[PDB]
Amino acid sequence: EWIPETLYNTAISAVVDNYIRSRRDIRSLPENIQFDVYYKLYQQGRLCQLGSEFCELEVFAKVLRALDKRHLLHHCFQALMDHGVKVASVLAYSFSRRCSYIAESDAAVKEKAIQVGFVLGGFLSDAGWYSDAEKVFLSCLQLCTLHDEMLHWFRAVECCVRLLHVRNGNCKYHLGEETFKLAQTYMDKLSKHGQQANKAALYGELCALLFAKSHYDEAYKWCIEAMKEITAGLPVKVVVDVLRQASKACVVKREFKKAEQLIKHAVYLARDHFGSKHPKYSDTLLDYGFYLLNVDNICQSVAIYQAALDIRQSVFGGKNIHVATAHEDLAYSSYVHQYSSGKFDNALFHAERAIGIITHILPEDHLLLASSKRVKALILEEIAIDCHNKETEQRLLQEAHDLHLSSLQLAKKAFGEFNVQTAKHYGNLGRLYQSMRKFKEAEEMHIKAIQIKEQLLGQEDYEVALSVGHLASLYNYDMNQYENAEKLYLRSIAIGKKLFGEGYSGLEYDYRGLIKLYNSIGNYEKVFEYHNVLSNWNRLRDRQYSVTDALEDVSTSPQSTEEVVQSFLIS
Amino acid sequence: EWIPETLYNTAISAVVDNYIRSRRDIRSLPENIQFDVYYKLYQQGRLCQLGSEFCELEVFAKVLRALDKRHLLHHCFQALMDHGVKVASVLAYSFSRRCSYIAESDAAVKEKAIQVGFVLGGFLSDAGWYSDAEKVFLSCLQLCTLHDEMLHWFRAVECCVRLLHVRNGNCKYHLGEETFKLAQTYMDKLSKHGQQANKAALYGELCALLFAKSHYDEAYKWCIEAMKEITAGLPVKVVVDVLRQASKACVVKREFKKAEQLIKHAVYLARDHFGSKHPKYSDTLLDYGFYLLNVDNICQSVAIYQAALDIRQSVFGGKNIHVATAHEDLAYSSYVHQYSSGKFDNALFHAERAIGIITHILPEDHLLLASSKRVKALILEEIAIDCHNKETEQRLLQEAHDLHLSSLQLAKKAFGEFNVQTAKHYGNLGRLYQSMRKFKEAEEMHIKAIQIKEQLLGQEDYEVALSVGHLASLYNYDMNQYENAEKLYLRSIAIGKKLFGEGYSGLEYDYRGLIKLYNSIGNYEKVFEYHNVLSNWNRLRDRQYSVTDALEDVSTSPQSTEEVVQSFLISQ
Amino acid sequence: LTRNKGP
Amino acid sequence: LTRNKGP
Ligand SMILES: [Zn+2]
């Protein structure tokens, strides 16, 4: 309707058009104007004029104090890193160099820098520059451990809970345990002087540290300890983080009743305070889609990951580790959802995009490449089977042969040989060797995959049963070991029935294997029965996936805080 | 495994193979053997040798006494009626002649004759020979009137409730009221003697009559009166009949909460006492499919009718009016289910079978053809609408014109000008006129149907909404009366969400009509404001498409008797 | 299409 | 589809 522009917006464009002459005076403007002048430079595409000021710590500390427009700063900063200027590396180094210059100074300035280091390091941790946020927090931690005043131990843990968050996302787990041990040094000493600091965010990081190393028995131990310290007076960001990590640790313990009430509360709790276009809300959705994918609620799990990616594709620009983690999670879910269809074009595009981002920003010998290379390799081996060309089949399998063994070494070097991720990479090699006509190597991988999954996790688990069916399918379809596949097919189904009932989608690949099991040895009476069971599974499968999208499943105000924790704790 | 057959079956085959020589001595066999010899003759294809004995009333009366294998006897009897011998007419004539002979006799022989007539007329009414079952029941009723004692007064009500049932399925609604007045006469004079007779079956017959006659307001009153009289000592057949008739009557009154429980309990009772392959269970399945077809449950309504038809295609295999009723009920349900797809090959095949049976067994001027030839016509226009050939479209539209006008004449002669079914045929003729490019009198048909639907059934009702939806579609597509279709579409959606919410199937059609209406009168800001509502309807139907199959919806022991009746009574 | 189901 | 999804 041709609404005239505000005099404020009109004066933004006039100052930006005369930026070079007045670049010194803009730095003396109020923070709300100063961010808007700098945001207009990004909108005009003048990233070099804008990026030459974000490289300065004092200027960036001023635009970090505009808290409401952080969704635009996270998008200018990401556009700057993609533009080719290392503002995250400079600001982390410029702060650390400046931080080390006030070590002998007074405690009045030494506390202002920690305030600057928490809004800067917390921004880089939010933006996904964990290798650079860690350098900021290590300087903030060094400030807390010089003068032994009462408030300093209250902040040294507050560094060590964020120093531990920037090492979990950076996969520095072997420094993660050293950080938590360092956190208790100031936590115990603070508790001595009549002040019990709240161990809620600190214990929640181990719920993600130990889950990442697949110490599920150990992670659930600290999952309970984290939620015992949740208080209604805590920040929502701290509370939301614990509920996500608790949900992640509860699902992998093969218990789902307690997990749904936590994450669904967390999705609503993040959608209330933050909104539907916040990085923290997208963090819940990826953890919420972690629930749906594992509990076989796969049809709506793609939308949750797609919703999470759409938030991160807007806030976090083009090439970010937070966009990449959303891509590699959506690609796996699109792999799982479209596994029955056999078409992998959206899934491969997301999987290729995730590795195209991680390889650009992270080193080629980094642990987050293990999950991204794995997801694409599962897609690559399934595209070549579905296509008819033999040369493409013999190349994509070898292309996926590169990724799994490259991924396996990353898991073996970091997590060790005896761990779930290492065993989970063996199971993918078991699928891989089966499709590469190397049948004898596929068996010894599956036996090694089970004997590790069965050992640490236990006899009855989702992960071990999912790989038994692959071993059962190997003994059945091609290498003609029908005497051994019978007990493995039933073992996989029995565990699947126990945790998922008849709605588990993998029973189709188990019932069809059982049909093939008896068509070559005899006992045709069970073929009719299992076909009926497959028929019984078929129409029962078409009863629950038609439920509405999980975004509105949480609804509005379903439950309340300090009650979901209590409901979880008693059970 | 080759298990040897029993000596009973071996001697059955040996006696049949020597049937002609020993046909006289077979008639002296016990009751259970005689049916097995006769069913063996049927199995051997010797219908014409078998039909020589079923035409005798004495022989068939002993065959009827074997109630275990009545499912076999119905199929055998239907095979004989299709064989070319009119056994049902012969049996009814023989029974009436013998009753007219033994009317002037003692009460013991009259008791025996009334029992024979009860079993025989009940069999023929179960078989579907209503015109041939009135004669038996009229003979029994005549036997009840010669002596005015207590037992004759008691059984005259039974003859008049079974005579009412063979006159609602035969569409003798004009004689039904007279029969019911006679039933009240005997019931009142029985109540004068300090002995009340239970009135559940008779009032259920009135419920069926007045629903078929489309006196819904009084049909509801009479089903209330029927279910006030359901006790625990009643036969299960009577209770099932009353429950299913009251379920049918509650649907047309637009109270879709009690009818669910009524039809669920009726289906449970039918599947418990009788079984899953009994004609009574098939009748309950037809009424249950009527329920599902009415409230939006088309995908299971077509499944229940297929279950109902498969029962009647085995108990009554051949040209029977019950198989024809199942066909004409299923064809309309398949018409609704395949309406969105537009492919009518199974539905047309089942609609043609229904007419192919009724025209064979019933006269060409009979009311059940009106409900049959209409349904096929609804298919014939929809095939004509969904085909590209102009000549084929014209020929099928003319055929549907003939069928609709014949059905309208049958309904007008039977019921009258001002009734619900006549308005149904008026609305069908309006839709057909809209299809045959004759929009001038399609509007006349639509207002003619609406002025009868909203008068008798109230201004807000399901069929009123459907007719005003047809009128709005006629206005806003080609007639280009865009200032009148809007209020009719709003009325349609307001009535639809009143009873069925936003899950109604016609909402897609009226929303597309609204899009067409708004794409030519400006107001482009509302085209997408209704397109997103159409998308919401589409996703609602996608989510509601997955419902458990209606056959096991009743499950096993959902409720108990004398509980659903009481809940229905106190819910008023 | 173009109309609803017949009554 | 001779096997299951990847863990
Ligand atoms: Zn013959």
PDB file of C-alpha atoms and ligand atoms in Angstrom, chain B residues 46-52 80 83-85, ligand 1:
ATOM      1  CA  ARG B  46     -31.462 -83.914  -8.731  1.00  0.00           C
ATOM      2  CA  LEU B  47     -33.573 -80.835  -8.059  1.00  0.00           C
ATOM      3  CA  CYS B  48     -36.394 -82.050 -10.289  1.00  0.00           C
ATOM      4  CA  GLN B  49     -36.524 -85.353  -8.410  1.00  0.00           C
ATOM      5  CA  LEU B  50     -36.334 -83.386  -5.149  1.00  0.00           C
ATOM      6  CA  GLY B  51     -38.879 -80.746  -6.170  1.00  0.00           C
ATOM      7  CA  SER B  52     -41.487 -83.482  -6.564  1.00  0.00           C
ATOM      8  CA  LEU B  80     -35.677 -75.196  -6.262  1.00  0.00           C
ATOM      9  CA  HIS B  83     -35.022 -74.473 -10.839  1.00  0.00           C
ATOM     10  CA  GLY B  84     -38.331 -73.375 -12.379  1.00  0.00           C
ATOM     11  CA  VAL B  85     -40.734 -74.972  -9.900  1.00  0.00           C
TER      12      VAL B  85
HETATM   13 ZN    ZN E   1     -37.804 -80.076 -12.241  1.00  0.00          ZN
END
